Predict the structure.
Amino acid sequence: MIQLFDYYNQETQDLHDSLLAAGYACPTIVIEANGFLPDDMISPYTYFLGDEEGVDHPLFFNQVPVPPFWEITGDHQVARVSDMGEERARIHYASQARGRLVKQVDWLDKKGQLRLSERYNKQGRCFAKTAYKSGQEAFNTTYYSTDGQERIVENHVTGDIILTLDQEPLRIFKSRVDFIRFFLERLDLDLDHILFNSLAYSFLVSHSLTGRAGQDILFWQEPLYDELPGNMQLILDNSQLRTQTIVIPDLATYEKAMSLAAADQQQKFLHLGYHYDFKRDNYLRKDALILTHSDQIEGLDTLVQSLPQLVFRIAALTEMSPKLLSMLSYKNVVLYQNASLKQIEQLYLESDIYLDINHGGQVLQAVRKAFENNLLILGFEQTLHDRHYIAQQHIFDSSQPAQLASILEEALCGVEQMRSALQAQGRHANDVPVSLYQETLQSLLGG
Amino acid sequence: MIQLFDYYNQETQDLHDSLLAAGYACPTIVIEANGFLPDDMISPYTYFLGDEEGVDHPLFFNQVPVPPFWEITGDHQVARVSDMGEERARIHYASQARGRLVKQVDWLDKKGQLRLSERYNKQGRCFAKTAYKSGQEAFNTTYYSTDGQERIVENHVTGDIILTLDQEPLRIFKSRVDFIRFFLERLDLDLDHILFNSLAYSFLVSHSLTGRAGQDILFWQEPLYDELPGNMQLILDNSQLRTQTIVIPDLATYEKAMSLAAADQQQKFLHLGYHYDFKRDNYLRKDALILTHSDQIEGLDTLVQSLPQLVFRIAALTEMSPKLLSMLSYKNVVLYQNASLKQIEQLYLESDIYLDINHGGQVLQAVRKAFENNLLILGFEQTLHDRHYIAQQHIFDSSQPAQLASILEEALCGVEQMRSALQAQGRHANDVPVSLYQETLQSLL
Amino acid sequence: STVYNINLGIGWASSGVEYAQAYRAQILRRIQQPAKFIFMDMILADNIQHLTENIGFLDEEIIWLYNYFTDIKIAPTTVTLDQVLAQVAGQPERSEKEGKIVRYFYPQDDQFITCYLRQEDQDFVEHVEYVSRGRLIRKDYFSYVRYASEYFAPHNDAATLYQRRFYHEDGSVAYDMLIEDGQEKLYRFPDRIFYSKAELVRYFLQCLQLQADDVVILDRETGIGQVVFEESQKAKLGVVVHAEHFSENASSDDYILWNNFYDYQFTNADKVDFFIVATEAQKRILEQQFQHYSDKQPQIATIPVGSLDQLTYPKEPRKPYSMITASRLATEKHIDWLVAATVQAHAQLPELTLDIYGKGSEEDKLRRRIEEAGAQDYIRLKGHADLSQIYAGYELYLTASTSEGFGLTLMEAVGSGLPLIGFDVRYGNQTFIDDGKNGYLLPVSSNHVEDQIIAAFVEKIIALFSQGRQQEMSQHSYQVAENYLTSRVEAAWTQLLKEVRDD
Amino acid sequence: STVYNINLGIGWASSGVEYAQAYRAQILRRIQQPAKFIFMDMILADNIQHLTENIGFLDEEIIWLYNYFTDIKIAPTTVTLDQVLAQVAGQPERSEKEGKIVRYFYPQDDQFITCYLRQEDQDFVEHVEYVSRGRLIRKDYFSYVRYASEYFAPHNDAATLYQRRFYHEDGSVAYDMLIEDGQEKLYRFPDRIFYSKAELVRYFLQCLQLQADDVVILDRETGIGQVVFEESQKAKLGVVVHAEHFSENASSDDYILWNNFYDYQFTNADKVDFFIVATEAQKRILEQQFQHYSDKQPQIATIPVGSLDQLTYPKEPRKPYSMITASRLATEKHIDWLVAATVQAHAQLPELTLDIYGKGSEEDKLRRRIEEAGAQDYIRLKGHADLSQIYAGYELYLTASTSEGFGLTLMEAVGSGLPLIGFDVRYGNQTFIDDGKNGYLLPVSSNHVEDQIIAAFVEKIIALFSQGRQQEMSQHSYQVAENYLTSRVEAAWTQLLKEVRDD
Ligand SMILES: [Mg+2]
Ligand SMILES: [Mg+2]
């Protein structure tokens, strides 16, 4: 058994974490060249490079090696390399709880166009450089050993992948599918079942294995619209392919899927969800927690005077403009500025709501961390995503019913007044029991 | 009396050179800030900066002072300054026979846009820097005394000329017309009659004084088309403006200068030509001269078989392609390349018919130089400018047949027919004797 | 052998860095150590020399960047309207004087020259603008001659700066620059052309021809840090740290976030010969965060920003039971905790009173509650006073500062004699206080909880007002003050230059 | 201390500057002055070692710019077809061989590899192209390892070089570069990034770490001129003049037109420590043109490009009245006249005979002209030959070329005791022909008119073929040649570098 995921992201982590809870621990393959992979997983691009497993000590933005005397600077969202004030590179931040960790540094020419992308892993090493031709089109990507030798050269124009491993002769793979396939055979992975999350290469590995016997499941996590993706058809229309099963954790689209699938054609759609591991129960207490980058929180003044019983805690690791420092005039508000990670954890204990009221960009997956801590989330239509975790009943217009939160919010007056609400956002995120996997699967998962 | 000349060029030199033949030599002022001016002309922009008069020794292209170690390269056409390989400045050549002389240097920014124009003079100094704003639009020009002071700073957006002389208070003029008049009244020149060649700032300095004693003229040269400028119409209609008398030297510019205007407009504008100083007679030596920047000289393959009588002298200042040097083995052809400036003077003295048959860039005012020595000029319908000096009995077809091109002037063997062709040459150039100058102007003083 | 101090700019009202410099200049005189002070910004609003001299800089110590390329000298503006009009032509019909802007009209063709004067009463013109037909076309700046001017043109019907020229004593052009988008994009010398201010600054420091025994001290890095580092490698380079170098709320056991003004210098510390911190509390920890995080061991030296001239022993009666706070008033102050904890300490203590000197933002809300609170008449109110001598007429001092890099009022306070209570926070309260001995340092939690400290203020207030301590810890409060006074400053400042150059 | 000679390219047909450099290497060896010979061009089509060894350098003497940054030695290509096939996975079905190209096919995968050999009769492989589905995706370059690789991708169905990479002995990446329009626009090192080849050459010259008594000798300037000048100032810089250094026709008493290949070096001569010209004739000319046109007096030294190990005396035959010419026959060297000049001197003298050697373009036409005017084959023509042994067999050498900067033929001709007859023109003729002593210098007009040249040639062929004077000039070739022996050129080099190292 294997799980083969195109990309690594939270949607594939949730799918992966759920399956693992239900007793599915197989090897997991991410096709993407991602440099920060959970030790759980591997990738054919990063697998042969010689990095030491289980090391997390990435580069800090100012540890990027630069020409002598060149100046590294950066804020909380990005960084820069300069020669005499002239822009040279962009340092991009790996999105982690810890900030300013080096993911990818983008070198420029003197006219400012992108030329190289040098990629960093969780161990702080640079394992890949991407080279760009004229239009800022990707030419190729080289993957280096820890000794600086070419292990993988992937030509992006032709698709050809040149694989040269140590003390082995040179192998050319005509396509990404053919490379992954070499990787599966090379590791002698048991192919009973391939569970995969997309219609990209992770599918085309299955579609091209029909000669071999086994059956695979596709967990379809993306949105649906007027039609089906063309390829989501050939799994319904063809009867011989290794994958005859389409799991769709999001309900709302499962209905849209059943809508567009023909009456004969809906036998293949299984529906499921994810099993979240929540960190603690609610307790219905008095305290607000908002994470903002800067102001102003839409309708804070409105909500705060109207419900003076509720504690309001707002945090940032930036510093706060006196525009908001004006609002702590109230003894009703508590404000945390240049907030520590330690401090931001404490507030996720001491607050049972998260109002998604702020403007600008999101602060360290705050909407998610609220959901994992069973804080009831509400906001207006300008929400910092994810929309995954907030129920429709809970969302508001952009101050059209400016406050209608507050006493819909005030339905916090006791135990099953809430227990309703957190099954509302609990349902909307498609929370299911670990048992629901066990039932929904072993009708398929044999071998 | 004065000569107020908008621009220096040869149309002005010929007009200036002929009035001195007629004894009209007076102080002459060119408005244009021109650093290469003959020793007898001045400009208000040039005068107060203090370079020793009479010195003509410009800068060679590789003498432009540049930051330490920067490299200067160039060809006969243009030079440039480079830092570690990347273009920084353009070095533009003064248009003379002597090559690669620095009239102005254009510095660029690292993105290649034009920023400064440092303007140079005959005496080898940079007397002006022009600064540019974002659009590559000119902002101001500073003119400097030889010791580094500011003398003139002209604002090209507001026109405001700020003039600060040595020891003198600083003044602010509002226009070049105001500036020219200060210049005139300052040297206290006698404003009897102002002889001026265009309807630009010069004429706005005559229309300027209409209330003041003296009467002046225009000499109109620039070619004319469907109809008159509004500005010669200002003065044909008005009687008491100080210019009422317009002459036009080129007869192909005049027949029409009436056709458009009524017979009332008509007392006003006289007629003339230029009196050129020719350096020698023809002598009908059977020799031809061709000065080319690069081949191929149109249909010359055709002429040379047809004229074994004719020697064809082809000279280029650079090297030429074996494409042409293949023709040397035609035994009536001689070739001169890496042509020396002196060597090419000899050829002008040894040939009597100038074919203007080459393609592309012409060479050191070659047609004019032929006309100056009574070379007979025939060329094809690429008649490389000047067309000024070509009678049209003489221009020919653009090589459709080249057969008539020669039997025209193959037809000149003895002494009378040659003559008749060269006044035809001289008449289209508007050659008049110095006598007619004194006749048409004796009326006015 | 010289000591070149680098800073960006200066102004009439200016702040700790400039005074730490101006102060530093005065010691460096007394040692005979020659020193210049370089200022990189473009300062035409005032004449540069007025600002330098006010803060106490001698004209022979001042290197202005844009001046250095001229023969003109740093000078006060001596040029008079009389002299200014000798240069203009025509005659002015009518003057007009509004404050310092005085102007004369030349209406014949429509002109005027607007003059801006150093002092309203005097005649010394700082700069003049020439307007013709309503448009500014020229602006000249004066010291004892015109040292520069500006050329303008209409754009969007707004007067726009396109060019700025700098002159020698005789009016010959030294160099000039192009202005587009309010930035200096080109500099043209006779023999040089430069496309950025960064590369101009390099030329300037190469023209200084720094050598092995000269010392470059960088007090501000913005835009010049990289070029100063490269051209100072031949010489001795040093970086001074004003305020706090890191951020602990963003740091961890493996990852430290420097303050964005020292990051380049710390990152590149192998190019720096030595560092200067205000307090040895800062040399203490920054030495180890260099050890823990980066494994680099740069030399760090403690050299206070101020000094005490003389230990101030008062000859008057010590006034028993009083109070004061002198700080630059804002929210960061937090003396509503000093306001309340005085009410909450007034119940048990006779006739106590504090004075609040310094004024500014938030002054409104302190007056708001000090009246409705219990001791209204016995807590003070009004602002600025020069307390140079008046500290000693007091008992104790009160600081709620969450941060002080170096306390300067504190600096004066211990020399003047007061015991001291403040939170235990970097670096000033920690270097000026022991919690026996001088005073009490209040440990502070990670967040604002008001009644935490208001009661925690009162308890160390009264432990000293109880005998015999109040004068006990005052009188040895000075045995530490004997290290922070001038002779010891000049010792280490002196001390530092020699072990820097024996390298 | 070492001498660094800087050149751009080299090839199989390489000549001029390169043969001069090769013998400067041979000289500098005996003097025991250690030298490196630097090449800046990107040479992949042949192993640069094969080219340098072909002209006589030792691999220990060669510095190639792009190899310098690696740890790989300059070495001949020893990688073999077997070793190349050993490291490609699979086994090829079929082989193909066309000249030096040998292709191996892998139809199972639809890929083939194209090996380019060194010699067709050996198995050594200089390059391998990897073609996947008819597309060139990679190419390797071999000496004793893979030292470089190129990566392609089709554009308008043309294989296009986008990137080139250089490796260490152990296979690790040394650095790579980005190709755009046949230009290398970005160089990426681990610790560096460079945006132009000029700035790359700078880093190269810096990595050389030139000391004060190192000597940098500039053989060619184009593209590297300024950077070699900026970086050689800390050492002793010198510039060699290989051709005529100015255009005389385009000059005057007022203005001189330099040769563009020397214009930068001449204009900046104030930055040059010494020049080097082939002939003392040229030393004096350039010496004054300096004095006249721009007053400067840079040191100019005279070293010959060649030399004679010994003077070869004949085997005691000389064919009565026989001549010799050896040139690379082209437009410029105009042997047309002297095949036509002696046909009239065989009239005035019975036994007169001459013959032409040398090989090149344009005189396929010669073999036609030989006797098609009725001349007869007592004027023999011979092709290519190495002539060291063959000059002494004749009584007279002959040259029609209009310009020579030095001449290598004349030196060996004179070294065999052959008088010369050539035009009076700079330089080699004026250097090797002492007029009347060993030969006759023929004035030529500023324009080439023909019939007088031939007549002036034949007239001095009988004045050099009637009599008593020829062996009584063949003296003077042996007279001038002893100045040209190898032992005396070793002297001038040792002295020049000793002089240079005292400033
Ligand atoms: Mg640099
Ligand atoms: Mg430079």
About this structure: Residues 186 and 195 of chain D are 5 Å apart (CA to CA). Chains D and C do not touch (no CB pair under 8 Å).
